[PDB]
């Protein structure tokens, strides 16, 4: 064949830290269908937002918003435990169906996005050029968000370890941990990946007695 229908830009959803996670890559032939399992960002999260995006940028805010919906009734559980299956199905007429189902509760929500939605030919060309020109910066943003999320994992696992340790953890150790947690918290608001990792390293240095407990 010398011609066929494609979806012209990547389609995905916003994930933790303001990043776009792709479900359907740009130039995929249509009809097409793809599913991916997601989980919750925070402990005890009972609702999630499915924000549908079109584009090639790593920052969710830089892509074209197609629509959004909420999925609630998720049993409050530790972060990473819920299994939220997100499906993107584009039919032969370019109609996009997005659904999200929580595997444990069976709760499901969906949206239909018309084929005419999104960016036009000139905006598609500008999106491709802008993604290309900002490739290094978008990579750096993605690396920062991963570090910010890992930074949060170390902050989360340390705090769980401290509460479990209780009275057994000495005062000198606990005070050094509390201050190092604050320094990490502050660096996380910044955009310097190395500064975050350094505050993570400083925390781990004062948590040696905590890891033993």
């Amino acid at each position: 064949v010398l011609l066929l229908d494609v979806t012209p830009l990547s389609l995905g959803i916003e994930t933790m830290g303001g990043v776009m996670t792709t479900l359907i890559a740009k130039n995929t032939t249509i009809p097409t269908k793809h599913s991916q399992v997601f989980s919750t960002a925070e402990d005890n999260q009972s609702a999630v937002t499915i924000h549908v995006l079109q584009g090639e940028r790593k920052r969710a805010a830089d892509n074209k918003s197609l629509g959004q919906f909420n999925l609630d009734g998720i049993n409050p559980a530790p972060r990473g435990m819920p299994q939220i299956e997100v499906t993107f199905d584009i039919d032969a007429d370019g109609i996009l169906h997005v659904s999200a189902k929580d595997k444990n509760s069976g709760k499901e929500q969906k949206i239909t996005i018309k084929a005419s939605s999104g960016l036009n030919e000139d905006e598609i060309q500008k999106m491709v050029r802008d993604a290309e020109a900002n490739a290094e910066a978008d990579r750096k943003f993605e690396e920062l968000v991963q570090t910010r999320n890992q930074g949060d994992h170390l902050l989360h696992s340390t705090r769980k370890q401290v509460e479990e340790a209780g009275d057994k953890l000495p005062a000198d150790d606990k005070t050094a941990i509390e201050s190092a947690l604050t320094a990490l918290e502050t660096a996380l608001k910044g955009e310097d990946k190395a500064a975050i990792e350094a505050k993570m390293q400083e925390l781990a240095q004062v948590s040696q007695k905590l890891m033993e407990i």
Binding site: K126, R129, D130, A133
Partner: peptide
């Protein structure tokens, strides 16, 4: 006077 970039080539 702030300066403006040219359109992406």
């Amino acid at each position: 006077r702030p300066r403006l970039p040219r359109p992406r080539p």
